[PDB]
């Protein structure tokens, strides 16, 4: 049953294309709030407190 494998393989290809779409939609939506994370740090006494770290 090669065709049954190939149809769902094309489905995984479409899913991979939508995954590359999602990888970039999220990276658009970084930018507009990233410059807002920037834009209001006027610095009276610097009350910043990052909470969750990141893996290497």
């Amino acid at each position: 049953h090669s065709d049954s494998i190939r149809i769902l393989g094309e489905n995984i290809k479409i899913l991979d294309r939508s995954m590359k779409t999602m990888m970039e939609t999220m990276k658009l939506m970084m930018e507009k709030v990233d410059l807002l994370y920037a834009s209001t740090a006027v610095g009276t006494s610097a009350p910043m407190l990052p909470s969750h770290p990141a893996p290497p």
Binding site: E24, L28, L35, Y37, A41, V42, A54, P56
Partner: protein, 1607 residues
């Protein structure tokens, strides 16, 4: 007791506040005594210059005429020991005029008196000193306070203010000495009277300190404004209207303007000196307030900053995409469904560049770049070295400021300086282990916010700056500095190469190429270069958003929040002004804001801190500004004063473009948060500062008046004594000699300052002996002498050299010229017994013997610092890395190195560097010399270093006054010192040391005119013919002539470098296998820059290597180090120019030291015992030649690279039977499209590219050419003209004809595929002396000399008349003289025929020209001119000595005159184009007739010769050329079609017998046009005819048949 007055010179900035704090309400007892000692009327501390103008000394207080005569003698012997002659007189006359003028001698004796007062008070146990009479003024010093008194009037000051005044007098003395020397040695006249007028002017300006010091601040900007006003008349000056210099002092403005009309370079040099003028207070009233106010200003609304930040992140992603696709050829990811350009979604898959993409900002918002690499936290230890001190954790700033100053201004004692508060050095606090782990140090930056103990910035006022408000340079905590180092290295290693703005700036070759492009464009003025200087560059950023890109840079390194802490760090950094004796108030153990001395939480991160991320931000907004207005950008930028190259746009003409571009950059950059004023940028091709160096129209200015007057910090881990000052003076002269200052100016200044420092530290008993003072300099730091500009070749030459023959030649000239005998030289030197080799050997070093000189201060820096870190650091850290002590295991390694014979330096150095003991020893070697470690290491070892200073002073007083002789040196002096230097090494080490001895240019080479040089004695020579007569202008303008896994790769380079020698020593293989297992590598068995100052002079000269008797032809290459020889010639030319003579004649180097030329002993090293460390923590020719061919192919593909990355000899030894095949394989297997092939067709027929130049460099001598089985087929086949035409018709031929390709299509290597590109050059440099090809066949041309049959008798039928090139062969065979004399008026290819004749020894009338023999050698391929024409007699001949061709008029010369008509019924030649006149009489040379000959390769032209079996296939080849060239798209085939027409006309004389176009994808050619798309475009031919015609038409294309038929 306690050490008083610890600084011999001042590095701290000046302030006059503590004087005012002492004047009112003093509490300390020495302040009270200072108030008692001063009079009623006290001048202000800022007005101290008004007291120091009145200080007059009784003239000629110090008898220094013995110093004058000694300096004359020392200059005479260093001039004669360089074996140059004319430069004695001008140097000592300049020194005499420096020491003779009454004001200069008064200033210099003031300097000597100041240094004597300092040397009596510095490192002195006594606290207060009595009244010391400096000339007329009484100075009395109590503890730290200094009281200066001229009768009634007085000034109270600090010890640092006294050091500021003493350094002002000192730097004035340096400026006056260097100015007399420079005005004697440079094109402009005497500097001296200008400085003499300006000192009295600056003490005669009737202004307060703020106004005239504001003039001092604007000395450099207003002079720059005057230069921009005078040089650019189309664009008005902008700085000329803001300052008060034309209004406040009209005489000063008149003098600056007069210097401007004489020379603006002179004005910039005089305006560029800093501390010859008096030290300002760095503007406590106004300037600190203005700088801290600009550091916290909000100039633009956040909305435009937000939008413009997206607008610049777009162009940052554009530049990173451009770099990543230009390097790795992979498109970074693109956005797909909610909004993007579909063409970019296609171009990501196809990987094609889109030019219209980069002009759009809204699409790079969509396109986001993936992670490409990872962040490596650990940096190299060679970039954490210096240039910035640290604060331990927010505690040094309390320690810095005076308790007394804060006590008077704010009434509290600051609780005093609390402690040492950590090491001031970054290195000492880093290695101690508190912040050792660099990932653990940078993990607070990974969390997103810094710790509170790290966020501090204490702003140091920069002394030695014209701007008196100045750039208060930042100083942060160790954590922020390590962040700066790691992040700058992370950009510079990875991201800056991927950014086109900074890929030029970080790569040194690309930085030089950008500087060359800028220097052409700013001087042509068609597309000139502008500069956006940013006065508030550091201050103009904002803590909310810096217009940042750090959010994307954080994702590209795969780190989290690591650069996003960089934008929030301006909120974190507390700013404190580190003006000495300045109080900022302390609130809660933390500063409080007052706006003048302090500013807590400003809008900026720091002055000079985080320069490279900010560089990308500024460059990104400027490039999107210039991309909105469609003008082509380049940027040279790294910090302040950012320079932008402007090109021509498609929108406006360059003047309208220029004004519109300035207005647009002001509007856009003003929108970016940096409020640019109208002055800070200029639309002018004038000036820019890059890399802390000033450039006027791209030419770097002479910094002699600035750098020499800049006093060295000195005393680096050393007590202040004689030797440290001499070594720092020598290194300052070296740093001048690198940075565009003449080393003869530096040497004269160094001799003057040397004898001054001697006069400070020696009694007059040594001084009254002139000959002894002459003796003292010229010994050298290797064998028992003090370091001088004279005795260090490293000042003159590059980093690596061996100075021993230079020191001994210096001593020989000292004995022969002066009255000093050998016994006096012996008692000065004290060579001593010097037994045993036990310690570490000196290889590729200054090469000290086992004797350590008694003059060098034996500072340990492997015992006391090691014991200090053993006792103090209870935590091991760097200790627990080295399990056992470093120097003990390294010394056991050196003891095992003593067992071997070859003793090779670089091999031992690299193998040592693989061990971690070298890593630790390199850390300690970094502790020996730095500018930050000195600030923590001088504070330890108190009162023993002062006793060391006194003990060394008395020791050298006893040593220089010793009598008779100390140790014998008498046999070594006379003659040469080859055997004597090897005997000194064999005496001190007990065994012969080879590989370390570099035979020096001072002995082996005597500079000469060729009339002054002898041929039969002084054999081998390097001569430097000039294109123009040099002057002092010629040192300014350029000419036409041109200029860790790495240790593992270098170890494998050494591995397959040992395969050259064909010596199989198993001990070598076992030791390097043990070191490879120490590395931990996976594969056990893995298969003319010059100094820079004389670079500008070298652009007018040429270079060669012409040493052909006994040193070049050998397999083992003799010891000549060529770059140092080239440098020596350039310095000799520079000396002749600066004396007053001109270089109008070529000057060579003469072979005197005949024994010093040593052949290398190709022998492999053996390690007797296994190293106890062991870590702690198919033939090569076929693959080498195939990879060499594909490397030539890929370099030619990337030209449309620099292939001089090899040893030149080993390719000439390598066979090229195997190169050419895979030179063709890459070009048949690439299968490029037509437009990509078009550039490769176009480029190769012109002499362009470094690849073509390297190919023409390796095709001078070629036994490789005859051995190649394509070449002995192709050279019968195609018409070869020159080296370039043969190579160009060789490499291009796989594209344009597969016919010869299909003959040799069945050959390839299977081991070719398993060879990386990092092994191929190693296999090129693995087969050099495996076979050197020592045949070197003379492919003999027409020898004549007899009667025989005609073999063709051709010579250069392609370029010149063939009858002219035969008579050069034909004269010398009738003369039967092995000698001939050739002048370079003859064409170099014509002389090649004469040089083919065997059994000659040709001694040309070169005039010593390096280029003429290099051309007629480079035309050769066979090698008859490299062997028969033996050069080191020819290169030393100026005129007629034997039978001479080339001059039109000469006594007894052989002259050639063209004859237009002659019958000449002669079987050898058809006619006689050039008649020859023998000794200026005509003799018929027709008696010479040809003979049977050997195999020829050049100048006889095999395809137009008798053979036709290759020409039948060559016809198919030329029809293949024309069927392929029409299919090539995007090319105008005029010259290649002309080469095809040459081959076709040559072919058409054999066949018995013009529209170019393609119809239906098949090229059809005839003279008549088939369709409308077709485009309209000797006696050797008799021998090229052959019998049985018709066989050429057999196996012939029908299209070729239509091509040959007319119409």
């Amino acid at each position: 007791a306690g050490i008083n007055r610890t600084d011999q010179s001042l590095k701290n900035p000046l302030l006059g506040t503590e004087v005012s704090f002492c004047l009112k309400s003093s509490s300390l007892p020495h302040h009270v005594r200072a108030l008692g000692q001063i009079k009623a009327r006290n001048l202000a501390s800022c007005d101290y210059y008004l007291l120091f103008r009145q200080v007059v000394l009784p003239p000629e207080v110090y008898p220094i005429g013995v110093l004058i005569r000694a300096a004359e003698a020392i200059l005479t012997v260093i001039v004669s020991a360089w074996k140059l002659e004319h430069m004695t007189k001008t140097l000592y006359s300049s020194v005499r005029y420096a020491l003779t003028n009454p004001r200069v001698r008064a200033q210099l004796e003031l300097h000597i008196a100041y240094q004597r007062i300092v040397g009596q008070v510095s490192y002195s146990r006594e606290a207060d000193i009595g009244p010391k009479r400096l000339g007329n003024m009484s100075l009395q010093f109590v503890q730290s306070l200094v009281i200066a008194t001229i009768d009634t009037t007085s000034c109270l000051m600090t010890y640092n203010h006294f050091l500021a005044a003493a350094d002002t007098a000192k730097s004035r003395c340096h400026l006056l000495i260097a100015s007399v020397v420079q005005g004697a040695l440079w094109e402009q006249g005497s500097f001296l009277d200008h400085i003499i007028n300006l000192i009295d002017t600056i003490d005669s300006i009737n202004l307060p300190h703020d106004d005239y010091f504001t003039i001092i601040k604007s000395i450099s900007p207003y002079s720059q404004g005057l230069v921009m006003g005078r040089h650019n008349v189309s664009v008005s000056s902008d700085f000329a209207s803001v300052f008060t210099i034309p209004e406040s002092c009209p005489q000063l403005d008149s003098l600056l303007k007069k210097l401007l009309q004489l020379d603006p370079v002179l004005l910039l040099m005089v305006s560029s000196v800093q501390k010859s003028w008096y030290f300002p207070e760095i503007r406590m009233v106004d300037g600190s307030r203005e700088q801290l106010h600009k550091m916290r200003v909000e100039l633009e609304t956040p909305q435009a900053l937000l939008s413009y930040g997206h607008t610049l992140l777009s162009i940052f992603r554009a530049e990173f995409i451009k770099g990543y696709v230009s390097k790795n050829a992979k498109w970074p990811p693109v956005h797909l469904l909610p909004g993007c350009d579909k063409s970019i979604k296609n171009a990501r898959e196809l990987g094609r560049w889109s030019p219209a993409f980069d002009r759009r900002w809204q699409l790079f918002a969509k396109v986001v770049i993936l992670r490409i690499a990872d962040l490596d936290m650990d940096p190299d230890f060679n970039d954490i070295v210096s240039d910035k001190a640290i604060i331990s954790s927010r505690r040094d700033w309390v320690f810095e400021y005076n308790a007394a100053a804060f006590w008077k201004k704010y009434g509290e004692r600051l609780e005093r300086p609390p402690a040492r508060s950590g090491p001031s050095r970054l290195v000492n606090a880093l290695i101690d282990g508190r912040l050792d782990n660099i990932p653990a140090l940078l993990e607070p930056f990974y969390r997103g916010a810094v710790e509170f103990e790290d966020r501090l910035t204490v702003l140091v006022p920069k002394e030695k700056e014209l701007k008196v408000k100045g750039r208060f340079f930042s100083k942060q905590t160790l954590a922020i500095r390590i962040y700066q180092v790691v992040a700058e290295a992370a950009l510079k290693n990875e991201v800056m190469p991927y950014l086109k703005t900074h890929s030029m700036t970080m790569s040194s070759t690309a930085l030089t190429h950008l500087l060359n492009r800028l220097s052409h464009t700013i001087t042509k003025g068609d597309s000139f270069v502008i500069n956006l200087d940013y006065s508030s560059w550091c201050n103009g950023f904002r803590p909310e958003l810096q217009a940042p890109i750090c959010r994307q840079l954080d994702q590209m390194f795969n780190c989290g929040y690591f650069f996003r802490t960089g934008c929030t760090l301006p909120c974190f950094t507390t700013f404190i002004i580190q003006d000495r004796f300045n109080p900022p108030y302390s609130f809660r153990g933390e500063p409080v804001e007052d706006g003048v001395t302090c500013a807590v939480g400003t809008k900026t991160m720091g002055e000079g801190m985080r320069q490279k991320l900010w560089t990308i931000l500024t460059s990104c907004w400027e490039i999107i500004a210039l991309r909105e207005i469609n003008v082509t950008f380049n940027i040279l930028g790294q910090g302040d004063n950012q320079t932008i190259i402007i090109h021509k746009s498609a929108s406006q003409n360059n003047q309208l473009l220029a004004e519109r571009a300035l207005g647009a950059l002001y509007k856009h950059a003003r929108l970016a948060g940096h409020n640019l004023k109208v002055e800070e940028c200029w639309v002018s091709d004038c000036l820019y500062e890059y890399g802390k160096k000033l450039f006027f129209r791209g030419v770097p200015v002479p910094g002699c008046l600035k750098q020499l007057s800049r006093v060295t910090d000195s005393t680096g881990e050393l007590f202040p004594n004689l030797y440290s000052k001499l070594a720092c003076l020598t290194s300052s002269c070296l740093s001048a000699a690198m940075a565009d200052t003449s080393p003869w100016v530096a040497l004269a200044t160094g001799v003057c300052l040397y004898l001054i420092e001697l006069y400070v530290e020696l009694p007059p008993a040594i001084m009254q002996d002139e000959s002894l003072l002459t003796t003292l300099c010229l010994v050298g730091p290797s064998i028992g002498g003090l370091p001088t500009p004279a005795t260090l070749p490293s000042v003159f030459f590059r980093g690596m050299s061996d100075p021993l023959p230079f020191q001994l030649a210096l001593l020989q000239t000292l004995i022969k010229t002066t009255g000093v005998t050998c016994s006096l030289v012996n008692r000065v030197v004290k060579l001593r017994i010097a037994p045993y080799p036990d310690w570490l050997s000196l290889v590729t070093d200054p090469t000290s013997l086992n004797i350590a000189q008694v003059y060098r201060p034996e500072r340990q820096i492997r015992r006391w610092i090691e014991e200090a870190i053993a006792t103090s650091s209870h935590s091991s850290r760097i200790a627990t890395f080295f399990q056992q002590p470093l120097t003990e295991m390294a010394q056991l390694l050196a003891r095992d190195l003593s067992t071997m014979m070859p003793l090779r330096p670089r091999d031992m150095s690299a193998l040592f560097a693989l061990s971690n003991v070298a890593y630790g020893l390199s850390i300690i070697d970094l502790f020996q010399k730095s500018s930050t470690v000195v600030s923590a290491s001088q504070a330890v070892h108190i009162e023993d270093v002062a006793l060391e200073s006194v003990r060394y002073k008395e020791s050298i007083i006893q040593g220089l006054l010793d009598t008779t002789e100390g140790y014998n040196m008498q046999p070594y002096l006379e003659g040469c010192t080859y055997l004597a230097a090897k005997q000194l090494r064999r005496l001190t080490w007990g065994r012969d040391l080879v590989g370390v001895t570099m035979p020096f240019v001072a002995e082996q080479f005597h500079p000469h005119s060729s009339v002054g040089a002898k041929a039969e004695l002084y054999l081998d020579a390097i001569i430097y013919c000039p294109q123009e007569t040099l002057r002092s202008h010629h040192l300014t303008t350029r000419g036409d002539q041109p200029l860790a896994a790495n240790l593992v790769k270098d170890t494998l380079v050494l591995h397959q470098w040992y395969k050259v020698r064909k010596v199989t020593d198993p001990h070598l293989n076992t030791l390097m296998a043990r070191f490879l297992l120490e590395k931990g590598y996976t594969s056990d068995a893995r298969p003319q820059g010059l100094t820079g100052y004389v670079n500008i002079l070298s652009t007018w000269l040429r270079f060669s290597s012409d040493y052909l008797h006994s040193f070049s032809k050998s397999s083992d290459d003799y010891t000549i180090h060529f770059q140092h020889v080239f440098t020596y010639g350039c310095l000799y030319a520079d000396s002749v120019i600066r004396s007053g003579g001109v270089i109008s004649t070529p000057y060579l180097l003469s072979a005197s030291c005949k024994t010093c030329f040593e052949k290398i002993d190709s022998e492999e090293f053996v390690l007797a015992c296994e190293p106890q460390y062991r870590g702690a923590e198919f033939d090569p020719c076929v693959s080498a030649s195939y990879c060499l061919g594909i490397l030539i192919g890929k370099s030619f593909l990337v030209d449309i690279a620099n292939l001089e990355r090899f040893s030149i000899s080993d390719m000439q030894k390598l066979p090229w039977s195997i190169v050419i095949r895979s030179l063709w394989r890459f070009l048949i297997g690439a299968r490029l499209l037509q437009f990509e092939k078009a550039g490769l067709i176009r480029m190769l027929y012109a002499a362009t590219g470094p690849t073509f130049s390297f190919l023409m460099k390796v095709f001078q001598d070629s036994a490789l050419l005859m051995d190649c089985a394509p070449l002995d087929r192709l050279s019968p086949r195609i018409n070869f003209h020159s080296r370039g035409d043969l190579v160009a018709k060789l490499v291009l031929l796989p594209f344009i004809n597969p016919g010869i390709v299909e003959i040799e299509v069945s050959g390839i290597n299977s081991k070719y595929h398993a060879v990386s590109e990092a092994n191929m050059d190693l296999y090129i440099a693995a087969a050099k002396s495996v076979g050197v090809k020592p045949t070197q066949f003379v492919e003999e041309t027409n020898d004549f000399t007899a009667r025989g049959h005609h073999h063709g008798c051709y010579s250069l039928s392609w370029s010149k008349s063939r009858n002219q090139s035969q008579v050069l062969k034909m004269v010398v065979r009738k003369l039967k003289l092995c000698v001939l004399y050739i002048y370079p008026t003859v064409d170099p290819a014509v002389a090649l025929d004469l040089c083919h004749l065997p059994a000659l020894t040709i001694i040309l009338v070169l005039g010593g020209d390096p280029a003429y023999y290099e051309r007629l050698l480079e035309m050769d391929l066979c090698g008859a001119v490299s062997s028969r024409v033996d050069i080191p007699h020819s290169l030393a001949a100026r005129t007629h000595k034997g039978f001479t061709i080339g001059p039109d008029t000469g006594p007894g010369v052989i002259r050639l005159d063209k004859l237009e008509s002659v019958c000449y019924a002669h079987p050898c030649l058809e006619e006689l184009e050039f008649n020859a006149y023998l000794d200026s009489e005509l003799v018929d040379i027709s008696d010479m007739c040809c003979l049977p000959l050997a195999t020829p390769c050049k100048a006889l032209f095999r395809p137009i010769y008798r053979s036709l079996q290759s020409f039948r296939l060559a016809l198919m080849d030329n029809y293949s050329f024309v069927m392929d060239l029409i299919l090539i798209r995007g090319l105008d085939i005029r010259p290649h079609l002309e080469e095809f027409d040459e081959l076709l006309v040559v072919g058409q004389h054999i066949l018995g017998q013009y529209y170019v176009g393609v119809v239906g994808k098949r090229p059809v050619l005839a003279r008549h046009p088939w369709s409308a798309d077709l485009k309209r475009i000797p006696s050797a031919a008799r021998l090229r005819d052959e019998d049985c015609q018709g066989s050429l038409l057999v196996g012939l294309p029908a299209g070729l048949t239509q091509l040959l038929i007319i119409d």
